[PDB]
Amino acid sequence: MSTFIFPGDSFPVDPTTPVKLGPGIYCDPNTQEIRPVNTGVLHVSAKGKSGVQTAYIDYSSKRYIPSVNDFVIGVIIGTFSDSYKVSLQNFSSSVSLSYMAFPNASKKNRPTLQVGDLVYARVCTAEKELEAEIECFDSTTGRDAGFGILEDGMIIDVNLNFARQLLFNNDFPLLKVLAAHTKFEVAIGLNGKIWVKCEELSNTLACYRTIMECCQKNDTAAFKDIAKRQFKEILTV
Amino acid sequence: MSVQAEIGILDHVDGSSEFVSQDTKVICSVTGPIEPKARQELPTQLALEIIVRPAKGVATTREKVLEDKLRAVLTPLITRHCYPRQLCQITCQILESGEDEAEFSLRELSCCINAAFLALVDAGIALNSMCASIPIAIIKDTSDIIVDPTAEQLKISLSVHTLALEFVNGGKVVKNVLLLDSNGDFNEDQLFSLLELGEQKCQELVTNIRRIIQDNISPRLVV
Amino acid sequence: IEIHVLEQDGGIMGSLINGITLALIDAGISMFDYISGISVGLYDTTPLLDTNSLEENAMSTVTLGVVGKSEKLSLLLVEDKIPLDRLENVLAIGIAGAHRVRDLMDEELRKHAQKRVSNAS
Amino acid sequence: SEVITITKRNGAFQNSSDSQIVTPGELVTDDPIWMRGHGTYFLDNMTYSSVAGTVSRVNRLLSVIPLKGRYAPETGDHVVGRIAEVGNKRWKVDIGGKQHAVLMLGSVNLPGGILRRKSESDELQMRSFLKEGDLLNAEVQSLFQDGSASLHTRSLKYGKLRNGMFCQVPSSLIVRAKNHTHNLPGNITVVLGVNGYIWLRKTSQMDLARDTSSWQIYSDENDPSISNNIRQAICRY
Amino acid sequence: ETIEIHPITFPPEVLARISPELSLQRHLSLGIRPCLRKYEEFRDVAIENNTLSRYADAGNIDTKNNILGSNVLKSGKTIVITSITGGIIEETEDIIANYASVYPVVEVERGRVGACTDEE
Amino acid sequence: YGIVELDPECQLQNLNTVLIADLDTEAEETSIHSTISILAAPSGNYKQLTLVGGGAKITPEMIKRSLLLSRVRADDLSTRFNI
Amino acid sequence: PREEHDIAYSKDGLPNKVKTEDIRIRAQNFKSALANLEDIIFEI
Amino acid sequence: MSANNGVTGKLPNLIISNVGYSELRKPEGVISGRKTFGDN
Amino acid sequence: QDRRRLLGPAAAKPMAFSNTESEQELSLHTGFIENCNGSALVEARSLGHQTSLITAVYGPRSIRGSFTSQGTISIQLKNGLLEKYNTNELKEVSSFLMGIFNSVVNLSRYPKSGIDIFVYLTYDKDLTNSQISSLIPHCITSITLALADAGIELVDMAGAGEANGTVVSFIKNGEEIVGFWKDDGDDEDLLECLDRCKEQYNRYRDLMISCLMNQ
Amino acid sequence: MSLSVAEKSYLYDSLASTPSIRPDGRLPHQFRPIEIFTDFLPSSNGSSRIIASDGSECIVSIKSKVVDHHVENELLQVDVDIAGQRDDALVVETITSLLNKVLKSGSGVDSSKLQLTKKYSFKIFVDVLVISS
Amino acid sequence: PEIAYPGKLICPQYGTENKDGEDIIFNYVPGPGTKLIQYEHNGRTLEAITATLVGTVRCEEEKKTDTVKNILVSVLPGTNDFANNLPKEGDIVLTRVTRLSLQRANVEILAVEDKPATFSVSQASSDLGETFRGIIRSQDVRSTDRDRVKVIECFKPGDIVRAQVLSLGDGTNYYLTTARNDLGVVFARAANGAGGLMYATDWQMMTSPVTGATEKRKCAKP
Amino acid sequence: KDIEISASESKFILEALRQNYRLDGRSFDQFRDVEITFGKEFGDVSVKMGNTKVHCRISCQIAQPYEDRPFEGLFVISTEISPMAGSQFENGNITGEDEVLCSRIIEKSVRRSGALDVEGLCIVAGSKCWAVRADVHFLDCDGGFIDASCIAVMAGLMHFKKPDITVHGEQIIVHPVNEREPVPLGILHIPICVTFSFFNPQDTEENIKGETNSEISIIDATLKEELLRDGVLTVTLNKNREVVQVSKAGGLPMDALTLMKCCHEAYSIIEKITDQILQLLKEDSEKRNKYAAMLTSEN
After folding, report:
1. What residues does each domain of chain I span?
2. Alpha carbons within 13 A on the beta-carbon side of K111
3. Which sign, positive or negative, has the C-alpha torsion A64, A68, A71, A74?
4. What else is known (chain F)?
5. Cα I169 to Cα I193: distance, rounded to the nearest angstrom
6. d(CA A168, CA I84)
7. Touching chains, B (3+ CB pairs < 8 A)
8. What is the CATH number that goes with domain I5-215?
9. Of G6, G7, G41, the CB nearest to E7
10. Which residues are L210's β-sheet partners?
11. G44 and chain K in contact, CB less than 8 A
12. Tag placement on chain E: N or C end, fewer CB within 10 Å?
């Protein structure tokens, strides 16, 4: 009972509407027609938005597609000069990051990071067809040094739609119960990466095992006891 | 309609599906888009490489053609311009025969398409339409036509047939044919009759399928 | 590392490793330690240091890749079928052999090593 | 009055100043006061050699000099390079040592000298001045973080060879002195590399200039006037 | 703005190397094929049979030859030669189990050295 | 056999959906995507048929047309070299 | 080195060998309307 | 910012194209990605 | 066995059978392969022995390896249908092939460019009731015609002539020799082995230039 | 090897002297000094070990075998290995195929001396391992 | 000397006329299709201009202005060949875009023009990866604003560029440029083949007629 | 095709072992739980240990034996990896090292060990025998493949049956399947392999000349666990307490006294799991026969 869809369905909305395209829909470069090309549920942006609406399909994936203004977590894999080699997901294509795209931008000053580090960065510029690029410090940071290299911590992989709910959603119950036990850090990566550092590795394993289990079960209401049990499983000791 | 399917049953792989029709168990796997090799890229469209493992024996020529006709069918299913300079490796496993591999390859070709279609839905890649395949045989002695035969009926079958169709507008409009695998003896006249059930049946198949997808994935979806 | 197996006499696995330990020192490559190798066989109850291929096809054998003077192992490989209970004793055999291996490697290098500088200088 | 040395020996695979001579795996001492350098590794006291070589005790520094190994490159040395490869504005060239030296694009004597200044069209002519396998005089500048070092030709005296023949030796027997170009009766000249590479050629005027045109520094030409009495005297040396 | 954008046109041999597709679309405009044919103009087929079998000469079948019945085929710009041998194993209505076949091996000499190509 | 669909843009003066057979000529083999291959013995018989439809639609009639074009091209070759 | 030929069938289906002279004129028709009509494209 | 200029100072349809999911959340990137959790 | 091909069931076996100065002649043809840029066709028939073979050119192909000053030749000999010469027997000839053309081809005209030569020992009769040595000179001729068809810079129509298990390749109308091959024969028959080879070379090169200049 | 062009002239100069000059200056018909060892693989019918002046290095082994000399034509087989190379390479196979021709069974080989009986004889194996060249 | 087989010996290095009593020397100059070959015959040496190819003799001359006479010998085909017209330094070569790097651009060589239009397309099959490929580096696209270079704003895969040879480079690829106002992009389809044909709006811009869509390409001067 | 993990994540697990923790929730010396389920065919089984999934298949057919052992039948195991089970892998690399590290084990675990009587494949000596086949498929990796393929093959042998035979010289009478029953096979001993997984928390020298043994060894490395391990060791045993194979091929150096102390713990593990197979083989065949009781009374 939702505006569920298939690639190859009838597109619902009239053609004469000024509409910002969301993802999941594709316009024909050959015959100018526009069709839903992915699986799942449409969510129509409601009216009043400057007279311009927007369609997007909820689709499920784990394999992250690099897109702009997106916070992801990356791994330093090579020192291609002027411009880092960095990966975002195993077996995927590597990403290029400037050595200068950094909050104290200084071209005589070459920074310090080494092969194998975890850094927080936002996709700055990425064509669909070109070597994609990211930034830690951005102009859209507005001189904010809010991204950066990480310390040790721990990183866990989830699927993407879950990670949206980690970012986009306050109704997402996860951050509540976790704060209800210990105090810690969290970095959110739209590449399905979740980087956490606690005061303790002990609680980090408690942080580890919940997020593996919860995202597996994917039942946000049930996550009250399931989270708290792993503490007892750590407090088994 | 003793068919049944599973979605999302592997772990480290992008798209996974178990397709189970009446006798044959086949699982397909989809990994993509991922890093392509040197000899494999295309500057414009999406490169595809397809592996089918049999249940028995190893990969030989008998496997090779069932692969390659399946290469032809997926290529318009995929919105291939969306992923330039990329690669999606897709892999199929035959687990159960359900048909004499020495004498036939019919059901598997119907099965693997119906298998790989669903792991792409798990994979969530930009696609174009909806699809279905069925095996159809015509009996040598009775001279009648059965949709979805069995292997003993294949022994008395005169001609074996696989139809792949492209389904749109609620999966209702036959947008195009994908594959018609006419094998065995046949004429003019049987053939338009040979479509005319599979004109219905594959839609009747997809009519089941449209339900199944949403049932498996809307709880995987969030509200 | 290039290998040329010329004449084969059984005990073939530990034969190799002892040749390796020469060759790395033969250029003087950076390393930690000697590494010794030897196949030791088992006729029914009795250990056999330094079997041959006739004995190898005759009974059960184990080869040990032994490191230096220690009791730590590099290589451990068992093909044949072995009753469990001997094995601790069996492992306790080969060390004294293996220590006498890297023993005999050492001086033999050293008497070469003396032959250099005494006639270099 | 012969052709070949054929002397026979059948029935055999083969015919068959005091200082510390130490082995790998061997303890030197465990006096903590000693410092630990090359050929040495350790665990907090245990001074452990790693090669076949000699104990060198320098005044508090203990280190192990081996006897066997490749040529060790050091700065300011006068050696001979064989051209391995051409890079971006780089060249690769064998020392005989562990790795290639590198050689910057502007690291070389230009024909016409410094009045010929820089040009980006010069990288379109890397193969013009240099190509593979060729032999030259080179001056060891400085190193990298590993121990790989680079070269240059800061003189007229350094440059691409001609007018003779190459030979090569082990690097050990070449003794160090304050001089390396040597001129020998027979009107000829040895160019002893340190690394084990040896070039002979006929004494030039620039060689004669050492003890009392410029456009020919990438030529494959020789002096056309080469007597056999030159040539046969080469072979005796 | 209504603009006379002058295009750039080429020799046709330039075009096909560049665009296989549009040069085809040039031929479809006149309704022809880039093999210079009209829609349904079909290639000639020329054979010689039985030339490379030893059973060519019915009069004098030669000695060391091992070929059963041979075929030459040229059609268009592709020459293909078919050769038949046979072997024997010691053996110990219209249904498929009555029915056997042969064992063929194709090679396409398409310039590429290497292993067995996937087209073959 | 090959069936293509046509651009209005590509015309030079001296929908629209054309059947071509006897396919050759790399540009053709690149660009034809809905195709038909048929076996047939000359009395109306058919050993196999092979449809890969990846470009155009397929009419019921291009089928019959190719069938009409099948029994010609085969039967001539049966009679051409009379072996 | 047999020169290739092309054939045709009429509505009978009887073999019609291609005249060699036609396709050259076709090619000269093909060269003609190509290079001349592709000079200026007057468009919106 | 003073260091630079102080020397000068003392002297056939309605298509609007694709967008990321970044723009599908309404505060538009003021969402701080890096959160520590404060004392409780 | 080989999982890449159709070789039948293993226990079968092929079929078995048991017993119950002359002229050479050519028919030389070019321009018949559209994959290549150089093709050549050779018929040969001599006294018990009829032979046909194909020489194929691909060039100049790019080299993914590195820089060279000049061109590089690659030559393949492959069995056709009936006659099966040995594998190591093949490449020895391929070695002997390349030496001659390295006194033929202006490689200096072709930097960083490759030469691909495919030779198909397609079909041979030997009805006669060093068996590869009888087919050497015809290869060089078959290559030269195809290499003229790709139009590559060649110094000379070089050819080889045969005299009884002996192969000698010439240039300059025989006034120099570019390629020498000898099997068993006599001793010091060399001077007659000059002659009969030379005149076949004097025959063959005229047959070759007729095949092209008259076309 | 890869050598330099300026040498290559001088090397082509000096050796093409009319009083011809080698780079080591031997007489034009000389060979170079070598070393020849055999009889050292006592599992073999014969062994061999030879040493070049440039340090090129090979060993050829001799194993025999009794065979029916009627059911087999080649009574003598050569098989070669070069270190550092594939089986598929050129210089391998030509040299390999060469020495078979050099040791054809009645060309310079006296297979009567190999003959055991009226029915049997000796299959021999020229088995070659080149360390370096 | 009219028609030539490879190996047709043609003329010596030098020749002589007498144009009106004063002696004039010919200088036969070797060109493409030629090679001077020395010939001893019955004792005495002789250099000769040699036909090395198939076709026609052509003897020409031109002196550089910016009693002997130089004569260039030139050898041709005559009544489909590209190894004749291998790319040299500085040539104008039509290529198809293979892959776009942030560093650089990679194309494959397809067609070489000629001087006083006359062309030579390569007859090779790129689907083998056969053909010669080259590289355009991104700073070599143009000279105007040669530093802050945005590579995507001039090129996409599969597109046609009138580009000039810089030099040989390696054996693997080429050094290539477009750095002129007459050079650059020739033709492509929209969205890399996913749409119709596109026309250069300016020398500096490109649109498409039916669509109403434009893209930035470093187009050639038309 | 390269797995990339941060060195920060590398220290993390290495710390967890230093405080005696591991990420899965098992003990160090604890093994996963095994799900064995058969398909309808004989020699058909699906075997599953949490994340790692495998499938294998047993078959047989008629062939002649070799000249080598003209007495005995023919048998071999295929273990061709498909990149389905993880994107690391080539399309069927039979020449990769880890593949060989999967290969030679199962080669020695079955073929050279001889759990199966090959002489009981001799139908007629030298004329016609059996060609028994074992195709191993991987589905999804969390490691333990070489232990999983150890089990799933030996699972498959105890579920396959071969049909009925009658000999008259050449008149070799393979009977219909459903009149004359298929006949199971003869297993001499049941081998079970064990992966051991090794972790130096220290440098090299404290393993080398640090006399204090300080090296952690666990069972059944998970995927992330497996990528950092320092030595590789597998032992195999039976119910009759004999050791089938041992393979430590290098890696980390390792005390001998540990290894015996390791291999004893293998014994109690493998025995319980072995009998769990033994009941389920019976119980499924009981379920086959109870459904055979639910068939003949039905028919």
Report:
1. 5-215
2. 22
3. positive
4. Present with 3180 molecules/cell in log phase SD medium.
5. 12
6. 73
7. A, E, F, I, K, L
8. 3.30.230.70
9. G41
10. none
11. yes
12. N
Question: Which CA distances in Å does I138 have to I44, I51, I195, K7, K218?
Answer: 8, 10, 18, 19, 55
Residue H21: name the closest of J73, D27, A163 by CA: A163
Half-sphere exposure of F3 (CA within 13 A, CB side): 24
Rounded CA-CA distance A234/B18 in Å is 37
DSSP state of B221: S
Residue partners of E91: CB distance under 8 A and separation at least 6: none
- CATH code, domain with L18: 3.30.230.70
In whole angstroms, give the CA distance from residue B145 to residue B159.
9
> Within 13 Å and on the Cβ side, how many CA atoms surround K68?
6
Angle between helices B106-123 and B61-77 (to 10 degrees): 40
Experimental method: cryo-EM
Gaps in chain K (C to N distance exceeding 2.5 A) after: 66, 79, 116
* A205–chain L Cβ distance below 8 A for any pair: yes
Residues in C closer than 8 angstroms to L247, CB to CB, are: 76-78
Do residues A195 and A148 touch, judged by C-beta distance below 8 A? Answer: no
Q: D-contacting residues of J 36-75, CB under 8 Å? A: 36-40, 49
| K117 lies within 8 A of chain E by CB | no
Q: Which residues of E touch K110 (CB under 8 A)?
A: 17-18
Alpha helices in D102-174 (DSSP H): 126-129
Contact J31 D4 (CB under 8 A): yes
- Bridge pairing between strands A25-27 and A95-98: unpaired
**Does I touch A (3+ CB pairs < 8 Å)?**
no
Give bridge partners of residue I91 from the DSSP assignment: none
CA G24, CA G7: separation in Å to the nearest integer?
16
Contact criterion met (CB < 8 Å) for B58 and I3? yes
Contacts of residue L6 in chain A, CB cutoff 8 Å?
Answer: 75, 116-118, 155
Pick from A131, A114, A133: which is nearest to A123 by CA?
A133
3-state DSSP percent of chain A in helix, strand and coil, to 5: 20, 25, 55
In total, the C-beta contacts within 8 angstroms joining chain A to chain B are 87
Q: Which chains touch H (3 or more CB pairs under 8 A)?
A: A
Q: Residue D220: which residues within 8 A CB-CB, separation 6 or more?
A: D162, J5, J6, J9
Q: How many domains does chain L have?
A: 1
Q: Residue L259's closest chain C neighbor by CA?
A: C88
Tokens of L222: 């998970």
Q: Distance (Å, rounded) from C-alpha I60 to C-alpha B93?
A: 43
Residue L211: list chain D partners with CB under 8 A: none
Contact yes or no for D127 and K168 at CB 8 A = yes
Q: How far apart are CA D4 and CA J51, in angstroms?
A: 13
Residues of G in contact with E26 (CB under 8 A): 30, 34
3-state SS assignment for residue B135: strand
Per the structure block, which two tokens stand in for E60? 């004098």
Buried b / exposed e along B137-170 (16+ C-beta atoms within 10 A)? bbbbeeeebbbbbbbeebbebbbbbbbbbbbbee
Which amino acid does the sequence have at J50?
Answer: I
Q: Which residues contact A154 (CB under 8 A, 6 or more apart)?
A: A195, A196, A197, A204, A207, A208, L8, L9, L12
Distance CA C17, CA C23 (A): 10
Query: In chain L, which residues have their Cβ closer than 8 Å to the Cβ of D42?
Result: 205
Cβ-based neighbours of D118, under 8 Å, separated by 6 or more: D106
- The whole domain housing L123 covers 5-299
G26 → closest Cβ in E4, E32, E40: E32
Q: What is I14-68 written as a DSSP string?
A: E-----------EEEEE---SS-SEEEEEEEEETTEEEEEEEEEEEEEE-SS---
